[PDB]
Each structure stands twice: as structure tokens, then as C-alpha cells.
Symmetry: C2
Subunit: 449 residues, 2 copies
């Protein structure tokens, strides 16, 4: 039952050119914040991850989609906020590696242990560590793993796989890149094979391709991983209709949704940023991607469906949702693809908050794995990297720059970034904290021994 | 028994390679956060601005000087945090201009009105608006304006000058660039002249150069501003010895410290970042500036002195302290200079917090005017801009990149950034807010009518 307040509106209250018109606050927040602090148990937890969604990414998407004085009804609505560090470790020296990759950072919040770039569910000694999801299951809680990326990718994989390298998607890659994890060598298996063992109640995302591979050993040797899932009682859905038809999800009938061969379709289309793109060419206006589809479930829909099915568990549930392509498009220096995925994540967050506000014992956390390349710069900027001018909702031009790599892919950045929370124990994300603190925060909120 | 807690230790608690070793938290924070919330009146306010000190800057400086798992005793110690927006306005259209300069942002928090880049104390219609310092004085509270930059620069000027352009330092500049403000033309005069009129109790910084000019009119025409200063009852000091001598600071003997012709000297020195610097050049270890001087007050010293002289006013006081060269060095793509000035600012922040915890009715706020160019990237990064490898306290290499400009100066970025506070009404910086909210937050906390 409703009791802890969600920020209803932090947009500019009026005329931004007038005194007080750009204010996002309408009065003192001391009482609102006190009402936002509760140490009661967290029955459920919904962790929404925006891959590469640093503060810069959030601002750029707000400016374009909601206007500078706009307000993300989801992302900007969490009352308790802070900044956390996501540095990784050098595998050999054990010293800090200032710029993490997705695997190391996801392993940090899901296991509570720092690790080297590329590792999933293991530390620098390559020792396995239980994930928050495996722990949630073990305690009898329902579990959900949702993503717009291929399920073998770092963020969703980190919750159910323990491999020496994120590249070990299926048997083939594992045999070659993770010999110690290869099933035919006595290991736990590839990422996909371990995901099948983790047996979370709900798993929705892309990456159907790897399931076409066949196991090299074990009870399901010779069969495709898809065939294995069928044989192990999984109910596989591949589109919006089939997913909507699902009435239950549990250990007897775990749900596995494969909605795309690889990553799911991005929300918006737009040209890639170019050298001196803001000075030479004209401004870009993003446009809806025709490949999006009504047959393809949206992040928001997968989030609602997951919540519906998971909420059935009286004990409670842990659910993770990742807006994966914010990061992917940031790499491809594609403003529209990037901003579109942030807008996409915001809707998912809205479903999570709307649900949590009514339920009353749900902790919702919104953050990112690491910071990224994109920067909002002056219109007349002449940079060495890739830049693009964009027509925002304000009817003004915004210029974005990607200048930390001459290579094709734009790199990650080590800056600390925003972490926001709402609900029981949300106070633990305020101020300065570490990405590994999030693991302990979730563990404690759910009361996991 | 100080009820309002100041985060004493959020550094990695143990061995970062071990489970929980990188955790910055030791237990649940709900109670501590509740003890941090008070709506009682704020007798005093200390606003510390790190020019161009976005989260990236804070992270790089912490990484280098304290280690990734380190902790800034000052900057990282404020318990209530959020992210605020600082977009400015297009003067002609009145629409948002995504990347502000120091002038528009400073104007925003000091007056509560958004404006165009370059404007100081006026909106897009060039109309004046009271500053928080002018209002504080009018209310009978002591006023302090401190900066490591030339006092005519945007940040400290925004508190005491209303001009159409930030370039209007003195008579000459004003006459040519701010004719409507030019004294001999009916206006209120240049930034320096208006500063003298504002007459804050304490004004410490550099920018002596401009005081050499002579008024082109007014009750002090022909004389130099320095002369007009002393002629108007100003108590002028120019070094640590003299400054440390002043025992009072009020309207009859307003203190005016001019410790440098232009900007005050930087704390640290290092080579400028270069193309492929991290690859082609050796890792750098910052060196203390031999000419920082012991006859030159440090930001922390000026902060401490200011507080002494201003706290004698039983009514209360408002003090703004700026670590200016973080921004400037960031513009010069100079990691060491940039980091050194952040370390510098952290010391002043510790003094403010130390005083605030004791006094119990002081609101301390730490933030920045806008984000900057510097980014922490991967060691092997091959970027198109300027890079440099640095030897951190961790005994490991950190690479910093600047690639948002091909010109001489690296530029600002529009990303929302961290704002943290401690004391009465600190809750108003939490969550998403706007830079203009800060003006209103300070005005209300002090209860200025
Ligand atoms: Mg991902
Ligand atoms: Mg400044
Ligand atoms: Zn990522
Ligand atoms: Zn990435
Ligand atoms: Zn600035
Ligand atoms: Zn600047």
C-alpha cells in the first residue's frame, strides 16, 4: 500500500526565461525526503540498468526528448540519489583499473566482488561467487532477468553465468576462449548452458542464435541448447503474442523468451555522428524504427509481464531489467539510437515505479554499469572526434560529441555516475558509494542470510 | 553532541580484491540519513564552487590523489546528494542553450534567473536581478566572496556585478563592451566598480591588475579603483602575512584581499596532455608548484580566515568560496593542474564542514557551475584529442583524455552534475534539481525576506 512518495514532477515549473521559471522545486523537500526513508524489509527488488547510461547520457536524452527543463517521469522520479564508483581491477596486479567493461561492473553489483575486465561471476583468481539472483532463488524468491540485448551479453549473463571471459556465449566460443569452463573438459559450461542451469523463473531478451549450437557433453549432448531448454521443461516464447499468452512462470515451467537472433531492435533510427558533423551537415531529427514492431515486446512490456508473473511468489522476487542498447549506440556514435534506448528504459522504470508505489515493499534502483563517451557540447564546436547536431523538443539545436577513440567503437569512461533508488532501504544509494555496495544493499534489503 | 553527521569514512573498507573489500558502506544508512534532515533555519551558508568540477573531475582527482577506493574528507563527505541542470538560454530566442559558460550558470544560482552565456546578474532582456549576496547584506548578514581567480572573473563577479558581458572588467573594457553599463554613460559601471559598490564584508582573491584603472566619472573620477578602494574605507591586503593580520571585517573596514595581479597560482604542475600522450610519453607524477608561495594564502586559508571574520556577526553570514583553476586547467588540458586545484578545493571544503558541524546551523553546499572536457579512459586508449598517463596513489596508471575541441582551449559540456550539501535544508539538493533552485534554496534557508 502507497506510503513512500515518488517524484511527481521535477520539470521546469514555468517560463525558463523568467525569475523562478526554471525551478524544478516548488517548496522545501525535508518532509518529502523523511517520508522517503524506511528501513523495513524489501519484499521485492527491481534493479533497472541503463548500459553506459552515465549522467551525460541521461541529460542528452532528456534535452532531446523532454527538453532541457523536461522531466523523465521514470528515470528522474526516484527521490533518493547518489554517485557510485565502478572501477575494476587489473587481473595481474590486483590494483584498480580505472575504466571497467560491462562484465566486471555487472559482476561487482551482482556478486559484491571487484574483478578484471571481461570476467563474469568470478573474481581475479577466477573463483566463482554466488550472484544476487542465485541467492534470491536459493532463499525461495521468484527471479527475473530481462534485457534488450542478447541474453549471453555481460549484464544479463552476469546473474547466471560464471566464466573467465564474457566471450564464451556458447559451447564453441567456450571451448576456445574458456577451456576451463568447457563442458567437455569438466567445466560448468558456456554462458548459455549455465543460464539454462540457473533456471530463473523469467528470462526475456534477445540472443536466440547461440541456442542453435549443440552441447558437446552431458545429458543433452548432441542436442541444440534450444532442444535442451524444451527437454528441461522451459516454455519458450519468441514474440509479443506468445509472451502475452503466458499465464504462469516458475521452476516447474520456467519462462525463456527469445525475441531476436541477436540484440533486440533499437527504438529510433538516425545517421551516425561524423567528423565536424555539427558544422558541415544539417541538424538531425530522430525517427521511429520500422523494425521496432508490435510483434516484438517492448522493454516496458517485458518488465510488466515479468512483474506480473513474478509477483505470484508470496515470498517475493528479484528482477533485473537492462536497457542494453543505450551503450551499444553510444559506441557506434549514434545519438538517435542512444537517446532512443534511454527513452525506452525510462518507460520500463515507470512500470517498475508504478508497481512499487502500489505494492509498498518494493525497492527500485536505477543506475548504469559505467560512464560512456558522449558529451553535450556547444553548437559551434569543432572537435577532432565525431559530432552531430540534433533538433530537440525545445525546437533548438543540441550537439553531441564522441571523441575518445579514433577506432570504430567509442570507449567507456571512468567517471562516477548517478545511482537512484526508491522504497525500503533506498537510503543506501545516497552520497558516495561503490558499485559493490549495491550487491550488499540488495542482499540486506531482502534479508538474505 | 553534533546531531547532523558528516560522513567520516567512505573509502574502500578493505582489500579491494576480496569480497566486500571495495565496499564504502559499513551498515544501513537510513538512520544516519534521517539525522541529516532538518528544516530549522540556516544561520549561515557556505557555498563552495568547483569551477568545471563535474563528476568526471571529482573521480579523476580522487583516483590520482587518494586512490580509486580513496575518499575525499571534504568533497565526498557531504551526506545529501543529487544532480542538477545548468543549461543557459539563447539570448534572442529565449530557448535553452545546452552548454552554459561560467557567467550564465553563476548568474543562475546567485539570482535565480536563467540567462545567456556571458551575462552577469541580468536576464536575456539585460535587466538586473538581485544576487544572493546583495540580498544577504541587505538582510543584515555578513557577506564573503572568495576565489582563487581574478575577482573580476565570472564566478565572484556574478555575486556583485550586473553587466551585459563578463568581459567588462574595468572602465576601458566596460566602455567598449558594456556601453549601457559604462559609468560615464549612466550605467552602474564596470565589474570592479560595481564590486566596490556592493561592498561585501570579505572579498579575497586575485585580479589586482584591473584596480590599476581609473574611473572615467563618478565621485572618484581620475583616481584608480585601488585608490577609490582605500578612499572608500577599504582595508587592502596582498599576502598571507597581512591577511593573517586583519582582526575584523565589516562595512566600515571592508576587507579586500588582492593576492595576485591575475589568477592566483596553481597548486600542482605537470605537462600538458598531447596527441597519443598516454602511448608516446611516460606516465606522469605531478609536481608541486615551486612558486605557489607561502606568502600567498591557500584557498583553505582564505576560507578559514573569511569564516573567522564573518562568524562574529551574530545575525549570520553568507560565504561563497570558489576553486577556480580546476576549470582553467581543464581548459588547458593539464591533468596535474586540474587535479591539484580539486585537491585544493577539498581542503577548503573540510574547513567549511569542520566549522559547520560545530556551529550546527550552517548549510554547506559543494557543487560546480557546469561540466567539463576531461574524461578518464582506458590505458591503451588511442584517442583523436589530447591524452596523458598518470601515476596514481594506487601505484597504477590512469589515462585522462581531452577531445571535445581542436582549438587552444578544451570546452565545457552540458551534462548534469553532482551537488551535495550538509546542514539545515540540505534535502533540497537531493534528486534532480536545477541550478536556479540553488538560489531559491539558499534564499529560503537563510529566510531572506
Ligand atoms: Mg549490457
Ligand atoms: Mg570561475
Ligand atoms: Zn556497459
Ligand atoms: Zn560498452
Ligand atoms: Zn566554469
Ligand atoms: Zn570554463
Amino acid at each position: 500500500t502507497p506510503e513512500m512518495p515518488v517524484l511527481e514532477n521535477r520539470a521546469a515549473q514555468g517560463d525558463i526565461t523568467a525569475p523562478g521559471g526554471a525551478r524544478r522545486l516548488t517548496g522545501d523537500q525535508t518532509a518529502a525526503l523523511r517520508d522517503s526513508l524506511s528501513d523495513k524489509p524489501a519484499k521485492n527488488i527491481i534493479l533497472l540498468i541503463g548500459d553506459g547510461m552515465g549522467d551525460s547520457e541521461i541529460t542528452a536524452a532528456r534535452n532531446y526528448a523532454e527538453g532541457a527543463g523536461g522531466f523523465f517521469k521514470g528515470i528522474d522520479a526516484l527521490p533518493l540519489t547518489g554517485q557510485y564508483t565502478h572501477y575494476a581491477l587489473n587481473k595481474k596486479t590486483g590494483k584498480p583499473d580505472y575504466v571497467t567493461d560491462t562484465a566486471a561492473s555487472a559482476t561487482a553489483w551482482s556478486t559484491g566482488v571487484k574483478t578484471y575486465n571481461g570476467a563474469l561471476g568470478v573474481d581475479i583468481h577466477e573463483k566463482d561467487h554466488p550472484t544476487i539472483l542465485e541467492m534470491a532463488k536459493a532463499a525461495g524468491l521468484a527471479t527475473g532477468n530481462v534485457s534488450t540485448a542478447e541474453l549471453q551479453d555481460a549484464t544479463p549473463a552476469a546473474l547466471v553465468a560464471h566464466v573467465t571471459s564474457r566471450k564464451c556465449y556458447g559451447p564453441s566460443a567456450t571451448s576456445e576462449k574458456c577451456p576451463g569452463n568447457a563442458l567437455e573438459k569438466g567445466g560448468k559450461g558456456s554462458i548459455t548452458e549455465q543460464l539454462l542451469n540457473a533456471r530463473a523463473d523469467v528470462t526475456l531478451g534477445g540472443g536466440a542464435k547461440t541456442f542453435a549450437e549443440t552441447a558437446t557433453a552431458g545429458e543433452w549432448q548432441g542436442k541444440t541448447l534450444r532442444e535442451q531448454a524444451q527437454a528441461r521443461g522451459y516454455q519458450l516464447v519468441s514474440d509479443a503474442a506468445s509472451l502475452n499468452s503466458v499465464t504462469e512462470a516458475n521452476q516447474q515451467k520456467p519462462l525463456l523468451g527469445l525475441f531476436a537472433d541477436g540484440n533486440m531492435p533499437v527504438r529510433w533510427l538516425g545517421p551516425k555522428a561524423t567528423y565536424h558533423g555539427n558544422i558541415d551537415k544539417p541538424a538531425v531529427t530522430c525517427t521511429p524504427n520500422p523494425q521496432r514492431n508490435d510483434s516484438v515486446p517492448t522493454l516496458a512490456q517485458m518488465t510488466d509481464k515479468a512483474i506480473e508473473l513474478l509477483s505470484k511468489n508470496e515470498k517475493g522476487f528479484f528482477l533485473q531489467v537492462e536497457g542494453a542498447s543505450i551503450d551499444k549506440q553510444d559506441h557506434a556514435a549514434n545519438p538517435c539510437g542512444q537517446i532512443g534506448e534511454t527513452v525506452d528504459l525510462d518507460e520500463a522504470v515507470q512500470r517498475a515505479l508504478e508497481f512499487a508505489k502500489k505494492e509498498g515493499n518494493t525497492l527500485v534502483i536505477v543506475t548504469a554499469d559505467h560512464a560512456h563517451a558522449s558529451q553535450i557540447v556547444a553548437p559551434d564546436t569543432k572537435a577532432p572526434g565525431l559530432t552531430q547536431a540534433l533538433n530537440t523538443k525545445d525546437g533548438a539545436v543540441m550537439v553531441m560529441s564522441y571523441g575518445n577513440s579514433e577506432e570504430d567503437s567509442q570507449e567507456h569512461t571512468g567517471s562516477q555516475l548517478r545511482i537512484a533508488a526508491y522504497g525500503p532501504h533506498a537510503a543506501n544509494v545516497v552520497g558516495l558509494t561503490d558499485q559493490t555496495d549495491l550487491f550488499y544493499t540488495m542482499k540486506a534489503a531482502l534479508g538474505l542470510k
